[PDB]
Design a protein around this ligand. Structure first.
Ligand SMILES: [Mg+2]
Ligand SMILES: [Mg+2]
Ligand SMILES: [Mg+2]
Ligand SMILES: [Mg+2]
Ligand SMILES: [Mg+2]
Ligand SMILES: [Mg+2]
Ligand SMILES: [Mg+2]
Ligand SMILES: [Mg+2]
Ligand SMILES: [Mg+2]
Ligand SMILES: [Mg+2]
Ligand SMILES: [Mg+2]
Ligand SMILES: [Mg+2]
Ligand SMILES: [Mg+2]
Ligand SMILES: [Mg+2]
Ligand SMILES: [Mg+2]
Ligand SMILES: [Mg+2]
Ligand SMILES: [Mg+2]
Ligand SMILES: [Mg+2]
Ligand SMILES: [Mg+2]
Ligand SMILES: [Mg+2]
Ligand SMILES: [Mg+2]
Ligand SMILES: [Mg+2]
Ligand SMILES: [Mg+2]
Ligand SMILES: [Mg+2]
Ligand SMILES: [Mg+2]
Ligand SMILES: [Mg+2]
Ligand SMILES: [Mg+2]
Ligand SMILES: [Mg+2]
Ligand SMILES: [Mg+2]
Ligand SMILES: [Mg+2]
Ligand SMILES: [Mg+2]
Ligand SMILES: [Mg+2]
Ligand SMILES: [Mg+2]
Ligand SMILES: [Mg+2]
Ligand SMILES: [Mg+2]
Ligand SMILES: [Mg+2]
Ligand SMILES: [Mg+2]
Ligand SMILES: [Mg+2]
Ligand SMILES: [Mg+2]
Ligand SMILES: [Mg+2]
Ligand SMILES: [Mg+2]
Ligand SMILES: [Mg+2]
Ligand SMILES: [Mg+2]
Ligand SMILES: [Mg+2]
Ligand SMILES: [Mg+2]
Ligand SMILES: [Mg+2]
Ligand SMILES: [Mg+2]
Ligand SMILES: [Mg+2]
Ligand SMILES: [Mg+2]
Ligand SMILES: [Mg+2]
Ligand SMILES: [Mg+2]
Ligand SMILES: [Mg+2]
Ligand SMILES: [Mg+2]
Ligand SMILES: [Mg+2]
Ligand SMILES: [Mg+2]
Ligand SMILES: [Mg+2]
Ligand SMILES: [Mg+2]
Ligand SMILES: [Mg+2]
Ligand SMILES: [Mg+2]
Ligand SMILES: [Mg+2]
Ligand SMILES: [Mg+2]
Ligand SMILES: [Mg+2]
Ligand SMILES: [Mg+2]
Ligand SMILES: [Mg+2]
Ligand SMILES: [Mg+2]
Ligand SMILES: [Mg+2]
Ligand SMILES: [Mg+2]
Ligand SMILES: [Mg+2]
Ligand SMILES: [Mg+2]
Ligand SMILES: [Mg+2]
Ligand SMILES: [Mg+2]
Ligand SMILES: [Mg+2]
Ligand SMILES: [Mg+2]
Ligand SMILES: [Mg+2]
Ligand SMILES: [Mg+2]
Ligand SMILES: [Mg+2]
Ligand SMILES: [Mg+2]
Ligand SMILES: [Mg+2]
Ligand SMILES: [Mg+2]
Ligand SMILES: [Mg+2]
Ligand SMILES: [Mg+2]
Ligand SMILES: [Mg+2]
Ligand SMILES: [Mg+2]
Ligand SMILES: [Mg+2]
Ligand SMILES: [Mg+2]
Ligand SMILES: [Mg+2]
Ligand SMILES: [Mg+2]
Ligand SMILES: [Mg+2]
Ligand SMILES: [Mg+2]
Ligand SMILES: [Mg+2]
Ligand SMILES: [Mg+2]
Ligand SMILES: [Mg+2]
Ligand SMILES: [Mg+2]
Ligand SMILES: [Mg+2]
Ligand SMILES: [Mg+2]
Ligand SMILES: [Mg+2]
Ligand SMILES: [Mg+2]
Ligand SMILES: [Mg+2]
Ligand SMILES: [Mg+2]
Ligand SMILES: [Mg+2]
Ligand SMILES: [Mg+2]
Ligand SMILES: [Mg+2]
Ligand SMILES: [Mg+2]
Ligand SMILES: [Mg+2]
Ligand SMILES: [Mg+2]
Ligand SMILES: [Mg+2]
Ligand SMILES: [Mg+2]
Ligand SMILES: [Mg+2]
Ligand SMILES: [Mg+2]
Ligand SMILES: [Mg+2]
Ligand SMILES: [Mg+2]
Ligand SMILES: [Mg+2]
Ligand SMILES: [Mg+2]
Ligand SMILES: [Mg+2]
Ligand SMILES: [Mg+2]
Ligand SMILES: [Mg+2]
Ligand SMILES: [Mg+2]
Ligand SMILES: [Mg+2]
Ligand SMILES: [Mg+2]
Ligand SMILES: [Mg+2]
Ligand SMILES: [Mg+2]
Ligand SMILES: [Mg+2]
Ligand SMILES: [Mg+2]
Ligand SMILES: [Mg+2]
Ligand SMILES: [Mg+2]
Ligand SMILES: [Mg+2]
Ligand SMILES: [Mg+2]
Ligand SMILES: [Mg+2]
Ligand SMILES: [Mg+2]
Ligand SMILES: [Mg+2]
Ligand SMILES: [Mg+2]
Ligand SMILES: [Mg+2]
Ligand SMILES: [Mg+2]
Ligand SMILES: [Mg+2]
Ligand SMILES: [Mg+2]
Ligand SMILES: [Mg+2]
Ligand SMILES: [Mg+2]
Ligand SMILES: [Mg+2]
Ligand SMILES: [Mg+2]
Ligand SMILES: [Mg+2]
Ligand SMILES: [Mg+2]
Ligand SMILES: [Mg+2]
Ligand SMILES: [Mg+2]
Ligand SMILES: [Mg+2]
Ligand SMILES: [Mg+2]
Ligand SMILES: [Mg+2]
Ligand SMILES: [Mg+2]
Ligand SMILES: [Mg+2]
Ligand SMILES: [Mg+2]
Ligand SMILES: [Mg+2]
Ligand SMILES: [Mg+2]
Ligand SMILES: [Mg+2]
Ligand SMILES: [Mg+2]
Ligand SMILES: [Mg+2]
Ligand SMILES: [Mg+2]
Ligand SMILES: [Mg+2]
Ligand SMILES: [Mg+2]
Ligand SMILES: [Mg+2]
Ligand SMILES: [Mg+2]
Ligand SMILES: [Mg+2]
Ligand SMILES: [Mg+2]
Ligand SMILES: [Mg+2]
Ligand SMILES: [Mg+2]
Ligand SMILES: [Mg+2]
Ligand SMILES: [Mg+2]
Ligand SMILES: [Mg+2]
Ligand SMILES: [Mg+2]
Ligand SMILES: [Mg+2]
Ligand SMILES: [Mg+2]
Ligand SMILES: [Mg+2]
Ligand SMILES: [Mg+2]
Ligand SMILES: [Mg+2]
Ligand SMILES: [Mg+2]
Ligand SMILES: [Mg+2]
Ligand SMILES: [Mg+2]
Ligand SMILES: [Mg+2]
Ligand SMILES: [Mg+2]
Ligand SMILES: [Mg+2]
Ligand SMILES: [Mg+2]
Ligand SMILES: [Mg+2]
Ligand SMILES: [Mg+2]
Ligand SMILES: [Mg+2]
Ligand SMILES: [Mg+2]
Ligand SMILES: [Mg+2]
Ligand SMILES: [Mg+2]
Ligand SMILES: [Mg+2]
Ligand SMILES: [Mg+2]
Ligand SMILES: [Mg+2]
Ligand SMILES: [Mg+2]
Ligand SMILES: [Mg+2]
Ligand SMILES: [Mg+2]
Ligand SMILES: [Mg+2]
Ligand SMILES: [Mg+2]
Ligand SMILES: [Mg+2]
Ligand SMILES: [Mg+2]
Ligand SMILES: [Mg+2]
Ligand SMILES: [Mg+2]
Ligand SMILES: [Mg+2]
Ligand SMILES: [Mg+2]
Ligand SMILES: [Mg+2]
Ligand SMILES: [Mg+2]
Ligand SMILES: [Mg+2]
Ligand SMILES: [Mg+2]
Ligand SMILES: [Mg+2]
Ligand SMILES: [Mg+2]
Ligand SMILES: [Mg+2]
Ligand SMILES: [Mg+2]
Ligand SMILES: [Mg+2]
Ligand SMILES: [Mg+2]
Ligand SMILES: [Mg+2]
Ligand SMILES: [Mg+2]
Ligand SMILES: [Mg+2]
Ligand SMILES: [Mg+2]
Ligand SMILES: [Mg+2]
Ligand SMILES: [Mg+2]
Ligand SMILES: [Mg+2]
Ligand SMILES: [Mg+2]
Ligand SMILES: [Mg+2]
Ligand SMILES: [Mg+2]
Ligand SMILES: [Mg+2]
Ligand SMILES: [Zn+2]
Lengths: 141, 154, 59, 53, 110, 83
RNA sequence: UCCCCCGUGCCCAUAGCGGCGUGGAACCACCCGUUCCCAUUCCGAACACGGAAGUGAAACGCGCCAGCGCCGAUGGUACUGGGCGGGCGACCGCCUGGGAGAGUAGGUCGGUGCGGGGGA
RNA sequence: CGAUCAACGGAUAAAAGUUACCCCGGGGAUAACAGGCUGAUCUCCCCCGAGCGUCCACAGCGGCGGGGAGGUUUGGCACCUCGAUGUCGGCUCGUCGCAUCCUGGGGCUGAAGAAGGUCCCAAGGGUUGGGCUGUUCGCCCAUUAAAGCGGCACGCGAGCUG
RNA sequence: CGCCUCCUAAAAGGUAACGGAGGCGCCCAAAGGUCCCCUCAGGCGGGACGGAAAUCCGCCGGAGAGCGCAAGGGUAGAAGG
RNA sequence: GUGGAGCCUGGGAGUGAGGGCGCGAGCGAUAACGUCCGCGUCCGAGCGCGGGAACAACCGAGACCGCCAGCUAAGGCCCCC
């Protein structure tokens, strides 16, 4: 599963989640993409689940681009503890994801293969999504 | 190549009022002019999807001028995935840099070219996974110069 | 010219700098009208509480 | 200060009065310190010698 | 990229200009030696001298002392007495020293 | 009522705030000795009629008016202009 | 007053890197020497002194070039002081004032003060 | 000059434990019961359709992930109550919810019949006697149409038990 | 449990939690004063033993080295040698 | 800018359990009528008044007394009203 190999600091303060995505809003590599409509902390498990779903639909074929990376350490205290006594341990990693971000792209595949694969992937995601196709607006960026 | 697009001058209309009015705020510039313009949004959409920064669009400003432009920038509203501003580069004889498509006989869909507006080609043809060549070995029709370092993989 | 200023909305619940602005202008009670000079420094306090107040240009 | 870095007084060698307080590392600097310093009593500069504090 | 020459010249000039005095700046070529007393607050040279202007020749050192007296002579005329010596990139020695000794001999205060 | 044992944090220390920064701004009247800038290193440099103490503190040498000057690659200086 | 050079400032790369061209009468440099002053953790390389046969090769000065560097609009956007709404929220929207960063067009192979030598 | 007066503005020069034999002054400023808020955990219900099911994604299943509901678990928080809101279980007496254990009505079935599986509707009524343990629960015995799950201050000690 | 550095800290200062990370309880007789001089790391090419790295030479290199020890600030027009 | 403004000297205090809400963060689980700070507000002390079915802190608004007079604010105008 994805996660940083090394890190300066083990624990980050919690995000804010305002504003449209900072970058990565245009299709950059493949033909079709999957776009976030709402903000969220997308976990590494969600990503890995959306990715495998698109592989088993492409039956090992095509290309898959994952343009979000879970770099934000996610912390949780052990069950039933009281508050305080310092920050909980790192239990996972999320990628901050805001409306307009292209999270995944595909190519090497028919339009029907890609639209379905991207549809299945969005069901693995804790947010609403939208499938896009590489336009000239994309190539002008 | 090539296309035509009605374009009207603006001065103090709010871009929000124009956008709400189904139009696209824009600007027109070169070494000699700078004008605030607006195109009708739906009209621009059907031209740019075909013309797409590679091909010439002639703007028909109401004052009779037909200025030949290349789209040089399109800022999008990242939430809605809708264009919200256009930079029309008024073409005149001086040599410009632009992106020319590549059609093969596949990394780069196009390539950056230094050319005179007269010599603006439609194609740059290529040849015959996993193998690849570089822009060094490339066609270069009359008037066009590889506007990168040939270290680029294609 | 001068500015006739009517306080038509209560400062209660608004920040203290806005309450102080009303005091600089001498507006103490609701519906109170005051005609002050149209100077830039009086105008700055009128604009500060413009959501509380109704302004008219006079003479 | 420490066991090897000891405090010490500087005694005017001409009127015997201790005039300054300082330190040294007695391992790095075993010899007694000798430094010219102004003596307020002799109202003049004079050789000063380390003594035990 | 600075050379040791430029680093030296900045190093001594920075220290002089902190004191606020008029700067007796000395430049020494392989043939000639030049002096000009400088106001760094106004950016104006107040008085100058040189073997090239005085058309002197002979022993470079003996000539260096001469421009020193010549620079002093004209300096006292305009009221300038106190001054700070600027050896720039030069060691305080020989030709520069002789010009320095000359200026004092003529009455400049440094 | 079960109460789960808790560990502890190895952190929780911070040092006193040092109140650093500029103490007299451009155009203010100051007296010789007035502190002008508290700083670590030479974030600002002593200009005309300004001294610098062992902890880089900038202070006025004459009565007068503070002036700032941004000399680019030469650095930011604080001056005191005589009255 | 104008051109060249020398010295010294100021703006702090629109002033830099690189490529090229150019200058020795004067000025500057290299250079000729190492007796003398002075000098090398060794070295006359440096620092220094005494010189004037040579060369602008190096350095420096002046030009031309936009490859790199550096500067950089306009327009649009983000954000936001103040004023208002919306959503269970995560968060979003309006009015008014302010308004980036990136990027596009484009610009740049410096500009200027004071003194000195020379020239017309 | 003599301070790990380091509990570092440093009570004495000089100091540890225990109390279920305990006492008083106070606190719901603060824990344990119950409630409340929350819902991580808990119980239940959905979305996706990778696979299983000889064949066949969906009879019966549902990888990896996603969305909720409920408020019976453990808790989190500490808001009424410490000038007292008695605290487990049982017995007695009910009453309610339905996410239904049985009985009634259905659809689908990998439904021949009989018997089952799964889901839908349905809370009218019913939902046994014992062995063990304080037990709740659970396991066991013998039956049964069935031997349901939860709420009512873990319903009910000015009703009993202890 | 006192002290230092960074963040949290909302572009003056200050700002909390059993919030996120480190350090101090020394040291130096020069590692102090002043004067004079010098300029790093690293990259590449060259050189017996000699290596990734000893010392030597050339070129490039504005500071990414160094400044006793944490961190931050500062700094070669020196605070570094 | 003449205000229950400000500055100086002195007498008398009380307070050193806050709370809700908006915004900004940390802790928590992008939980809590949760906790901890920052800016602001209100309740506290305005449990006086109107609106919000009822309701400290949401909206409206700062109650000196009297009137069987008029205008408005939020919010309302089918009946309870
Ligand atoms: Mg947080
Ligand atoms: Mg961020
Ligand atoms: Mg999560
Ligand atoms: Mg977390
Ligand atoms: Mg945690
Ligand atoms: Mg904690
Ligand atoms: Mg994003
Ligand atoms: Mg989804
Ligand atoms: Mg489509
Ligand atoms: Mg599109
Ligand atoms: Mg971009
Ligand atoms: Mg037409
Ligand atoms: Mg469109
Ligand atoms: Mg381009
Ligand atoms: Mg109001
Ligand atoms: Mg209000
Ligand atoms: Mg209001
Ligand atoms: Mg308000
Ligand atoms: Mg307001
Ligand atoms: Mg204010
Ligand atoms: Mg009133
Ligand atoms: Mg009134
Ligand atoms: Mg204001
Ligand atoms: Mg010592
Ligand atoms: Mg005495
Ligand atoms: Mg001793
Ligand atoms: Mg002579
Ligand atoms: Mg001479
Ligand atoms: Mg000099
Ligand atoms: Mg409990
Ligand atoms: Mg508990
Ligand atoms: Mg319990
Ligand atoms: Mg610890
Ligand atoms: Mg703290
Ligand atoms: Mg502090
Ligand atoms: Mg603090
Ligand atoms: Mg701090
Ligand atoms: Mg400051
Ligand atoms: Mg000092
Ligand atoms: Mg100024
Ligand atoms: Mg000045
Ligand atoms: Mg003249
Ligand atoms: Mg020059
Ligand atoms: Mg000049
Ligand atoms: Mg070149
Ligand atoms: Mg030549
Ligand atoms: Mg040249
Ligand atoms: Mg010559
Ligand atoms: Mg010649
Ligand atoms: Mg000799
Ligand atoms: Mg040359
Ligand atoms: Mg360029
Ligand atoms: Mg800039
Ligand atoms: Mg820019
Ligand atoms: Mg702008
Ligand atoms: Mg926006
Ligand atoms: Mg705004
Ligand atoms: Mg703000
Ligand atoms: Mg403000
Ligand atoms: Mg706002
Ligand atoms: Mg709301
Ligand atoms: Mg939610
Ligand atoms: Mg907004
Ligand atoms: Mg917005
Ligand atoms: Mg705005
Ligand atoms: Mg605006
Ligand atoms: Mg900009
Ligand atoms: Mg533009
Ligand atoms: Mg360009
Ligand atoms: Mg350009
Ligand atoms: Mg040019
Ligand atoms: Mg240039
Ligand atoms: Mg020029
Ligand atoms: Mg110049
Ligand atoms: Mg000047
Ligand atoms: Mg001149
Ligand atoms: Mg002349
Ligand atoms: Mg001249
Ligand atoms: Mg102790
Ligand atoms: Mg003690
Ligand atoms: Mg203590
Ligand atoms: Mg203290
Ligand atoms: Mg004691
Ligand atoms: Mg004792
Ligand atoms: Mg004790
Ligand atoms: Mg014991
Ligand atoms: Mg006892
Ligand atoms: Mg006992
Ligand atoms: Mg007891
Ligand atoms: Mg006993
Ligand atoms: Mg007894
Ligand atoms: Mg007894
Ligand atoms: Mg007793
Ligand atoms: Mg007793
Ligand atoms: Mg008792
Ligand atoms: Mg008793
Ligand atoms: Mg008692
Ligand atoms: Mg009592
Ligand atoms: Mg009490
Ligand atoms: Mg309580
Ligand atoms: Mg307490
Ligand atoms: Mg209480
Ligand atoms: Mg309790
Ligand atoms: Mg309890
Ligand atoms: Mg309790
Ligand atoms: Mg109870
Ligand atoms: Mg409880
Ligand atoms: Mg209760
Ligand atoms: Mg809930
Ligand atoms: Mg729930
Ligand atoms: Mg849950
Ligand atoms: Mg459901
Ligand atoms: Mg199969
Ligand atoms: Mg089947
Ligand atoms: Mg599952
Ligand atoms: Mg969920
Ligand atoms: Mg839920
Ligand atoms: Mg769930
Ligand atoms: Mg409950
Ligand atoms: Mg409960
Ligand atoms: Mg509920
Ligand atoms: Mg338990
Ligand atoms: Mg509970
Ligand atoms: Mg509390
Ligand atoms: Mg109690
Ligand atoms: Mg009682
Ligand atoms: Mg009672
Ligand atoms: Mg009682
Ligand atoms: Mg009672
Ligand atoms: Mg019985
Ligand atoms: Mg029951
Ligand atoms: Mg049912
Ligand atoms: Mg049945
Ligand atoms: Mg049936
Ligand atoms: Mg059935
Ligand atoms: Mg059968
Ligand atoms: Mg049957
Ligand atoms: Mg069914
Ligand atoms: Mg029933
Ligand atoms: Mg029943
Ligand atoms: Mg028996
Ligand atoms: Mg029994
Ligand atoms: Mg039992
Ligand atoms: Mg049991
Ligand atoms: Mg049975
Ligand atoms: Mg049966
Ligand atoms: Mg039984
Ligand atoms: Mg029950
Ligand atoms: Mg029951
Ligand atoms: Mg209950
Ligand atoms: Mg319970
Ligand atoms: Mg129980
Ligand atoms: Mg219990
Ligand atoms: Mg009970
Ligand atoms: Mg009971
Ligand atoms: Mg009883
Ligand atoms: Mg009982
Ligand atoms: Mg009872
Ligand atoms: Mg009772
Ligand atoms: Mg009772
Ligand atoms: Mg008993
Ligand atoms: Mg303390
Ligand atoms: Mg301490
Ligand atoms: Mg601050
Ligand atoms: Mg800070
Ligand atoms: Mg202060
Ligand atoms: Mg506090
Ligand atoms: Mg730590
Ligand atoms: Mg420690
Ligand atoms: Mg010594
Ligand atoms: Mg040191
Ligand atoms: Mg020394
Ligand atoms: Mg080698
Ligand atoms: Mg070697
Ligand atoms: Mg080191
Ligand atoms: Mg260390
Ligand atoms: Mg450094
Ligand atoms: Mg008052
Ligand atoms: Mg008062
Ligand atoms: Mg007062
Ligand atoms: Mg006061
Ligand atoms: Mg007073
Ligand atoms: Mg007083
Ligand atoms: Mg009294
Ligand atoms: Mg008190
Ligand atoms: Mg207290
Ligand atoms: Mg308060
Ligand atoms: Mg508080
Ligand atoms: Mg508190
Ligand atoms: Mg609160
Ligand atoms: Mg309340
Ligand atoms: Mg709140
Ligand atoms: Mg709000
Ligand atoms: Mg924070
Ligand atoms: Mg949750
Ligand atoms: Mg609270
Ligand atoms: Mg809250
Ligand atoms: Mg909170
Ligand atoms: Mg508050
Ligand atoms: Mg109120
Ligand atoms: Mg009330
Ligand atoms: Mg009440
Ligand atoms: Mg009250
Ligand atoms: Mg009310
Ligand atoms: Mg009401
Ligand atoms: Mg209500
Ligand atoms: Mg209420
Ligand atoms: Mg009230
Ligand atoms: Mg309110
Ligand atoms: Mg309102
Ligand atoms: Mg009021
Ligand atoms: Mg009143
Ligand atoms: Mg009232
Ligand atoms: Mg009144
Ligand atoms: Mg009316
Ligand atoms: Mg109304
Ligand atoms: Mg009605
Ligand atoms: Mg009624
Ligand atoms: Mg009614
Ligand atoms: Mg009516
Ligand atoms: Zn003595």
């Amino acid at each position: 599963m994805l996660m940083p190999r090394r890190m300066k600091y083990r624990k980050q303060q919690r995000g804010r989640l305002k504003g449209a995505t900072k970058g990565g809003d245009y299709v950059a590599f493949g033909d079709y993409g999957l776009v976030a409509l709402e903000p969220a902390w997308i976990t590494a498990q969600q990503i890995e689940a959306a990715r495998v779903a698109m592989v088993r639909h492409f039956r090992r074929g095509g290309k898959i681009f994952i343009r979000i990376f879970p770099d934000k350490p996610y912390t949780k205290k052990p069950l039933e503890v009281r508050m305080g006594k310092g920050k909980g341990n790192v239990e996972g990693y999320v990628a901050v994801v805001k409306p307009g971000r292209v999270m995944f792209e595909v190519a090497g595949v028919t339009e029907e293969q890609a639209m379905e694969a991207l549809r299945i992937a969005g069901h693995k995601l804790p947010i609403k999504t939208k499938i896009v196709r590489r336009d000239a607006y994309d190539e002008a960026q | 190549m090539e296309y035509r697009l009605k374009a009207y001058y603006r001065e103090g209309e709010k871009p929000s009022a124009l956008r709400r009015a189904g139009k696209l705020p824009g600007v027109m510039y070169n070494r000699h002019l700078n004008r605030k313009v607006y195109v009708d949004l739906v009209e621009f959409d059907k031209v740019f999807r075909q013309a797409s920064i590679h091909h010439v669009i002639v703007l028909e400003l109401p004052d009779g001028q037909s200025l030949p432009t290349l789209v040089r920038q399109v800022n999008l509203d990242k939430r809605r995935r809708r264009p919200e501003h256009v930079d029309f580069f008024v073409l005149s004889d001086e040599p410009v840099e632009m992106y020319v498509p590549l059609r093969f006989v596949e990394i780069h869909r196009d390539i950056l070219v230094k050319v005179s507006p007269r010599n603006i080609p439609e194609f740059i043809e290529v040849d015959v996974i996993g193998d690849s060549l570089h822009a060094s070995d490339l066609k270069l029709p009359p008037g066009v110069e590889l506007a990168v370092s040939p270290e680029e993989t294609i | 010219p001068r500015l006739k200023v009517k306080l038509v909305k209560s400062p209660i619940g608004y920040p203290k700098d806005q309450k102080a602005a009303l005091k600089a202008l001498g507006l103490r009670r609701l519906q109170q009208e005051r005609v002050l000079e149209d100077t830039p420094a009086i105008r700055g306090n009128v604009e500060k509480v413009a959501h509380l107040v109704r302004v008219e240009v006079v003479e | 200060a420490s066991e090897v870095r000891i405090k010490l007084l500087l005694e005017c060698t001409e009127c015997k009065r201790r005039n300054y307080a300082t330190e040294k590392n007695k391992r790095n600097t075993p010899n007694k310190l000798e430094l010219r310093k102004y003596c307020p009593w002799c109202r003049k500069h004079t050789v000063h010698r380390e003594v035990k504090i | 990229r600075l050379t040791a020459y430029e680093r030296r010249k900045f190093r001594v000039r920075n220290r002089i200009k902190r004191t606020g005095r008029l700067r007796l700046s000395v430049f020494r070529s392989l043939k000639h030696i030049y002096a000009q007393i400088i106001d760094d607050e106004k950016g104006v040279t107040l008085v100058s001298a040189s073997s090239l202007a005085l058309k002197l020749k002979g022993n470079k050192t003996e000539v260096a002392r001469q421009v020193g007296r010549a620079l002093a002579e004209k300096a006292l005329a305009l009221g300038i007495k106190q001054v700070a010596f600027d050896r720039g990139p030069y060691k305080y020695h020989g030709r520069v020293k002789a010009l320095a000794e000359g200026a004092r001999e003529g009455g400049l205060e440094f | 009522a079960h109460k789960k044992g808790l560990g502890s944090t190895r952190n929780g220390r911070d040092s006193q705030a040092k109140r650093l920064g500029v103490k007299r701004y451009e155009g203010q009247v100051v007296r010789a000795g007035n502190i002008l800038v508290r700083q670590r290193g030479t974030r600002f440099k002593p200009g005309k009629n300004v001294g610098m103490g062992r902890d880089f503190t900038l202070f006025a040498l004459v009565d007068g008016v503070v002036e700032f000057q941004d000399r680019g690659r030469l650095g930011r200086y604080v001056h005191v202009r005589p009255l």
